[PDB]
């Protein structure tokens with residue numbers, strides 16, 4: 062009938078132990094920006110692949126870029142991509158699932174229910190590290206997104222509760238996603254223009270597309286500087 | 290059965306790990322970082338113990354590429370490791386069936402040990418098929434540890450004490466990791482990972498006949 066085991070499904074809490082060790086993230090909090098950039102690049106690859114067969118895929122927004130803006134006075138970091146974007150359903154379900162993956166009840170049992178066992182595995186294997194590291198540097202994450210198949214919506218969470226609303230400004234993105242982080246007090250430095258510039262350059266290996274930072278050059282003029 | 294559920298959770302863990310270790314060049318940041326900690330440690334010892342800097346006068350990190358032999362060397366003049374440290378400690382970080390608790394020390398201190406060095410060890414084996422550790426601690430003779438990540442051995446170094454004090458990590462690089470034997474690749478990776486490190490870091494480099502000598506990067 063089958064290949065017999067035992068003890069040892071209980072010894073499956075090496076998984077619990079491994080999840081703890083991925084607390085390499087506390088030691089390397091700046092990885093949140095690497096992940097934001099990498100996920101931005103993925104969302105752009107995804108819409109690009111779609112445009113190969115769908116001539117209307119890029120209609121919402123012609124360009125394929127990542128735009129990062131610090132706002133020191135308001136304590137915000139924004140990372141904006143013109144990639145595939147996310148429907149309301151994806152904001153609710155898949156962020157819901159991703160935020161879940163850093164807990165006790167989610168891991169030790171499910172048990173393969175009711176989503177899509179392998180799809181959940183892939184969702185977390187890709188985005189888990191990014192979501193978790195963002196909440197090591199931010200008290201709130203706001204996700205504004207526009208997918209070709211839906212209207213623009215805004216998801217916000219403090220990691221404990223979330224809400225989603227239709228964006229009352231309508232479609233300002235054209236298509237794509239803005240991730241806005243309200244930074245923790247200790248994460249002050251990510252509001253600095255130099256710091257952000259140097260991190261973007263350090264992680265440009267993880268983008269297949271132009272990445273700009275809103276930056277000043279001397280009145281002093283502000284514009285998008287191309288980082289790669 | 291849940292055998293299938295567990296198998297899927299297994300696969301998710303692998304994907305998370307891959308995601309975490311998206312950047313393989315990180316192995317060198319960790320090696321340099323461990324070297325800085327070794328140096329930090331013997332310096333703290335030196336404040337109270339006048340013979341801490343007896344084996345080796347200086348406090349440096351030295352990196353050498355041996356292209357012909359396919360080797361990367363990272364040498365610190367830090368605290369070093371005893372034979373006991375090499376056997377007991379590196380064995381644990383390698384094995385991170387044996388996953389009751391409180392073994393086999395200080396298991397706050399096990400978590401601490403895997404915690405501090407685990408990442409450097411995993412990232413090493415992402416770019417290398419073999420890791421060789423030559424270490425000389427003030428309280429032991431020089432020893433050489435070697436692993437392919439599955440099994441390890443340790444021997445007294447037949448060359449005696451050639452380091453004075455400290456540790457050389459030698460990597461036998463994977464075929465695809467060849468680029469890390471290039472001078473310009475390593476130089477740039479050092480300058481990329483040298484902010485925190487206050488100790489001098491050197492790379493074995495050449496300048497035009499060509500003169501091979503240590504070059505300060507930070």
Ligand SMILES: C#CCCCn1cnc(N)c2nc(Sc3ccc(C)cc3C)nc1-2
Pocket residue numbers: 100101103104105107142144145146147156159188191192193195202204238240
């Ligand atoms: C790419 C792709 C396809 C899937 C949808 N999608 C599209 N664009 C992004 N930028 C995404 N980021 C996430 S997860 C995520 C991770 C961390 C944080 C802080 C926020 C989010 C939304 N999911 C994303």
Ligand SMILES: C#CCCCn1cnc(N)c2nc(Sc3ccc(C)cc3C)nc1-2
Pocket residue numbers: 323324326327328330365367368369370374379406409410413420422456458
């Ligand atoms: C610092 C300190 C104190 C403890 C002893 N010790 C001293 N010097 C080093 N350079 C160390 N590296 C490790 S772990 C390690 C991690 C990755 C790899 C590839 C090899 C090893 C031995 N342990 C080390």
